[PDB]
Design a protein around this ligand. Structure first.
Ligand SMILES: COc1ccccc1CCN1C[C@@H](C(N)=O)CCC1=O
Ligand SMILES: [Zn+2]
Length: 140
């Protein structure tokens, strides 16, 4: 589990969105595994606006933050899970790192701010849904 709290937005994995998230929906995209809802309180996270390919992510299944090198956001085939059939997920970045399904939501960050959240993984891989292109997260 986990979310990004930037401005009056809450960014979560779409497959982990709550009823409250759907009832306060701002934007969702199944192909990216992302959903954004509105919040009453202001958040403290800031979004990275950069082209970093190194950063640090939080792994809840180890209670640890790990440094990683990750690929550029791309269209990758993701195996069937409890929440989606086997399909292509867009804006996904892969790295070598430990992950288990419940690690979804953990933040990946770089020196500039939040880069994305854990969304896929398996067998010593971890995949992150990028948010750096969602410029509207920084305003209104
Ligand atoms: C960190 O994720 C791991 C790690 C190990 C093994 C599997 C996963 C996640 C598998 N999966 C894919 C998600 C997606 N973005 O399509 C949907 C929900 C889900 O359970
Ligand atoms: Zn950066």
């Amino acid at each position: 589990s986990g979310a990004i709290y930037v401005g009056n937005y809450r960014v979560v994995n779409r497959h982990l969105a709550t009823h409250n998230d759907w009832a306060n929906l701002v934007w969702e995209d199944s192909s990216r595994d992302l959903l954004v809802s509105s919040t009453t309180a202001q958040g403290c996270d800031t979004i990275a606006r950069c082209d970093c390919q190194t950063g640090v992510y939080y792994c809840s299944s180890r209670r640890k933050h790990y440094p990683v090198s990750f690929s550029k956001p791309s269209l990758i085939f993701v195996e069937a899970s409890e929440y989606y059939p086997a399909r292509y997920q867009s804006h996904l970045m892969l790295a070598v790192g430990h992950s288990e399904p419940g690690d979804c939501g953990g933040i990946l960050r770089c020196q500039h701010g939040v880069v994305g959240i854990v969304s896929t993984g398996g067998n010593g891989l971890v995949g992150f849904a990028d948010v750096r292109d969602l410029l509207w997260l920084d305003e209104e």
